[PDB]
RNA sequence: AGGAUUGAAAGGGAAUAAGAUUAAUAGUUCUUAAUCAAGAGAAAUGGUAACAUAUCAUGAACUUUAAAAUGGAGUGUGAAAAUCUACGGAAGAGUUCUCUUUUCUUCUUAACAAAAGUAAAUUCCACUGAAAUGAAUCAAUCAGAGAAGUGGAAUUUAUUGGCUUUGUAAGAAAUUCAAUGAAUUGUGGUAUUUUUGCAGUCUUCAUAAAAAUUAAAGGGAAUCUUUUGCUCGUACUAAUAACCGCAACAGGUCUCCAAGAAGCAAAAUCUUUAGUUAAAUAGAAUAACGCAGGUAAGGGAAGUCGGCAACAUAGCUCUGUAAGUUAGCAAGAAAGAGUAGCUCUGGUGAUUAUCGAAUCAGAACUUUAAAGGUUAGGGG
């Protein structure tokens, strides 16, 4: 697994044509946006909340999208 | 304490069986395989270790990045600095005493 | 730091006001019992001398024992720095 | 062992296949006298030597 | 171009981990997350330098160098784990008519990668040029073929880059609670052991493997996505019942992991996790003669081939120690004294008033007067 730093590498891994799965995850503290692309499993850990929904309204719709929370599925 | 068991089939203290105990989820503790300490490169001249060039196994070599895997420089990855300047000053040297000694001395 | 202590379901075991009496009587705030003039007395709300949580349940215990009611009703906590009383 | 060759492995299966006794109905057949199998053999009895 | 076959399930070697699952298999299955190999879609900069740059930035024949690939001892030390412990807690359990703010349990994290913060040791580079000689270690050892100082570079430290931290990752797992759903999962130590590295020192009429395979150099010839990964082993015992001794034989058979007390000690003795209470039958009575373990008045080898057997000495500290001698030893010679419990006192540091280590010495008081439960030289 690897992680992205800033911004502005998620939107553009987002708007990359490599995306296969998004799973995001709320913790007591931040939001994890886990990417799973076709090798690795890019994590963002977010603490902005405006910030995070920014980031919901750039996965494209098509793709699936797992909202994991204090219950696992 | 937590007593552990080798994992794999070999059962003898060997250099290529070392074995790390670390820890794990539960209090439970696990058995990595440890990899065996290796040497880096010689000058060809002198026998000191080169810098700038990592001690791993001559294999893994090949997967580090092209810069990684030597120094740049004249003979580097070889031969040492202090090797090199030798080696200069050797060709350069001798070769104007033999336009003086001979060659229309 | 305030301790409570439910009763809802065996107040009738045990009424609050033998329980009040007790604790003033037992903490040893500096190793003498009954010297708990900080101690606002089923709550304990104290802030001026050091507790614990644990040592609530430690007395409590030890109070169930002394009436012979111990085999009958269990000390839980309740998650919200407080005990319950359950059978 | 744990550890086997091929050919090995399949002489060790042979010699379980063949440690069987006489079936039932082999018993009941018109002047049968193959009642029990002599070259039976248990491991702790006798090692095969193979 | 150079020499054929075989020879290691302990030598060399491309690449996988955590959790869960079965009546039984699991670095092999499942979930999640990775890695490796083979394929498919006139030719670069920076730094004074040591040297550095998500593939970058061409590099054939031929040749060389290095790695794979190298004894042992002993000392110091970095890091991890276990044990112990300091502060702060949360949950559960045990004791409780005598006390005990109490005693115990849980508080965890992989492969592979990232680079907030921050280490120890060694070797090099630049400036300068040391004598009134300095620098340093437990020990050493080093310097005008250049010390110390200041500023840098590199390598090693069980994967990336050593440790904390981060992704994986809390959604797992552990401890509780309710009847599937809820809670918590700090920070340290100038302590011991183990493991793993590093640094120098000592020692040899001992110098302590090779190849497959990989990289680099000298030379200048030429102009991210995706597929596949075949064959064979894999159950179980590994021994006071699965192996070899005719057997469920007190014999024999190579290894890995390793808690507390006490102690110099992996010793004897007792206990926790795990295992077991059965391992060629028992019950009653309590004769002789036995096998194993003991004691004994007074005398003390008078027994006997012979002190055979047993008794006796036994740790640590201090004082003291002969003849003889290859001058190294004898020597723990021989011989004598001290040692318990409790209440105290002082010495040995770190950091800059707070904190920390077991070690040594000394003093009053008390008693059943103290190594002796176990372990543990008889001497001349």
């Not at chain 1, 963002?44 to 929370?69: F, G, M, R, S, T």
């Not at chain 2, 439970?28 to 300490?37: A, C, F, Y």
């Not at chain 3, 730091?1 to 809802?8: E, G, P, R, W």
């Not at chain 3, 614990?52 to 009703?73: A, F, G, Q, T, V």
Request: proline share 2%; net charge positive; aromatic share 8%.
């Amino acid at each position: 697994p690897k992680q992205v730093q800033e911004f502005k590498q998620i939107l553009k891994l987002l708007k990359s044509g490599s995306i296969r799965a998004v799973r995001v995850k709320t913790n007591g503290e931040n939001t994890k946006f886990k990417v799973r692309c076709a090798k690795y499993l890019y994590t963002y850990i977010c603490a902005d909340k405006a910030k995070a929904e920014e980031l919901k309204k750039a996965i494209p719709k098509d793709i699936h999208v797992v909202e994991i929370a204090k219950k696992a599925p | 304490a937590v007593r552990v068991t080798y994992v794999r089939k070999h059962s003898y203290n060997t250099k290529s069986n070392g074995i790390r105990i670390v820890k794990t989820a539960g209090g439970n503790m696990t058995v990595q395989h440890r990899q065996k300490i290796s040497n880096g490169v010689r000058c060809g001249d002198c026998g000191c270790v080169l810098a700038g060039i990592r001690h791993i196994r001559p294999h893994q070599y090949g997967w580090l990045g092209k810069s990684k895997r030597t120094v740049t420089r004249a003979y580097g990855g070889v031969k040492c600095h202090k090797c090199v300047q030798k080696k200069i000053l050797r060709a350069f040297l001798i070769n104007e005493h033999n336009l003086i000694k001979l060659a229309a001395a | 730091f305030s301790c409570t202590i439910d009763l809802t379901n065996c107040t009738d075991f045990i009424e609050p006001k033998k329980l009040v009496t007790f604790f003033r009587q037992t903490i040893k705030v500096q190793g003498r019992a009954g010297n708990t003039k900080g101690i606002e007395v089923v709550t304990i709300t104290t802030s001026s001398a050091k507790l614990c949580k644990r040592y609530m349940k430690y007395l409590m215990k030890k109070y169930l024992k002394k009436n012979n009611l111990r085999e009958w009703l269990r000390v839980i906590s309740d998650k919200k720095d407080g005990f319950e009383l359950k059978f | 062992t744990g550890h086997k060759g091929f050919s090995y492995k399949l002489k060790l299966g042979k010699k379980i296949h063949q440690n069987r006794g006489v079936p039932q109905w082999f018993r009941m057949k018109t002047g049968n006298t193959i009642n029990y199998n002599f070259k039976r053999r248990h491991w702790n009895r006798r090692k095969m030597g193979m």
